[PDB]
């Protein structure tokens, strides 16, 4: 059912439809053209054909911004390459014997790098490997809004590890807000989780807690 497309275009003038249809894959562009009112059809195609001779000023402006946005992505992504994030992602994907060997050597040789990589490897579910005191320390820094949102994207064992580390009442209160907030978007769960991730990272940066490995 493409139809919502047809109504969008139905009430436009031929040159605007020609401009709109030209940024599509031609089979899609044809399906839409075929469904447009019969009286508009021939003239839309004529305008599509003659579009590189008329050449609207809007087309160049669309390219001038398409160009800049793709350019900037390329510059932000590839001007510097590698780094601590890359290193962390690689270690998370290595076989356990290899990553223990690499981490073991870095604890001897360059201990602060090992720590940087350790912090950067941490991912939300790694809270399960934190000890109770560490979790308790993390909780007195995170607010209940941020925590509840973050757990809406969590497994039971994770939720349980949190519940065991708060007062018997505040656990029951937390369980309640999780039941009654409902619809939340992935984006909001991610940054809530990331807010917590940074707190865990800052606390280990200060030597307040240990991240297991
Ligand atoms: Ca980079
Ligand atoms: Ca440190």
Curated annotation (Swiss-Prot):
Domain of life assignment: Bacteria
Record key words, sorted: Bacterial flagellum, Cell inner membrane, Cell membrane, Chemotaxis, Flagellar rotation, Membrane
Membrane topology classification: Peripheral membrane protein
UniProt short sequence motif Part of the EHPQR-motif, positions renumbered to this chain: 12-15
GO molecular-function term, one example from the UniProt record: protein homodimerization activity
Site annotation Part of the EHPQR-motif: residues: 47
Keyword Cell membrane among UniProt keywords: yes
Disulphide bonds in the chain: none
Major location category of this protein: membrane
Record-level GO cellular component terms: bacterial-type flagellum basal body; plasma membrane
Localization, UniProt: Cell inner membrane; Bacterial flagellum basal body
One of the GO BP terms on file: chemotaxis
Subunit relationships: Homodimer in the absence of FliF. Interacts (via N-terminus) with FliF (via C-terminus) forming a heterodimer. Interacts (via central domain or via central domain and C-terminus) with FliM (via central domain).
Function, in words: One of the proteins that forms a switch complex that is proposed to be located at the base of the basal body. This complex interacts with chemotaxis proteins (such as CheY) in addition to contacting components of the motor that determine the direction of flagellar rotation.
Family: Belongs to the FliG family.
Protein name: Flagellar motor switch protein FliG
Organism: Thermotoga maritima (strain ATCC 43589 / DSM 3109 / JCM 10099 / NBRC 100826 / MSB8)
Originating gene: fliG
Whole-protein coverage range: 115 to 327 of 335
């Amino acid at each position: 059912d493409p139809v919502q497309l047809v109504n969008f275009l139905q009430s436009e003038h031929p040159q605007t439809i020609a401009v709109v249809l030209s940024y599509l894959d031609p089979p899609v562009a044809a399906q839409i053209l075929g469904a447009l009112p019969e009286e508009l059809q021939t003239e839309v195609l004529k305008r599509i054909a003659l579009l590189e001779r008329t050449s609207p000023e809007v087309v160049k402006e669309i390219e001038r911004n398409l160009e800049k946005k793709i350019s900037g992505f390329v510059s932000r992504t590839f001007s510097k390459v590698g780094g601590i994030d890359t290193a962390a992602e690689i270690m998370n994907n290595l076989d356990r014997t290899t990553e223990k060997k690499i981490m073991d050597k870095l604890v001897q040789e360059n201990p602060e790098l090992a720590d940087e990589i350790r912090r950067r490897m941490f991912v939300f579910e790694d809270i399960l490997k934190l000890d109770d005191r560490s979790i308790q320390l993390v909780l007195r820094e995170v607010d209940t809004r941020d925590l509840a949102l973050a757990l809406k994207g969590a497994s039971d064992e994770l939720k349980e590890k949190i519940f065991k580390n708060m007062s018997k009442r505040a656990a029951a209160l937390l369980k309640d807000e999780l039941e009654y907030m409902g619809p939340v978007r992935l984006k909001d769960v991610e940054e809530a989780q990331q807010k917590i991730i940074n707190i865990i990272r800052r606390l280990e940066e200060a030597g307040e807690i240990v991240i297991a490995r």
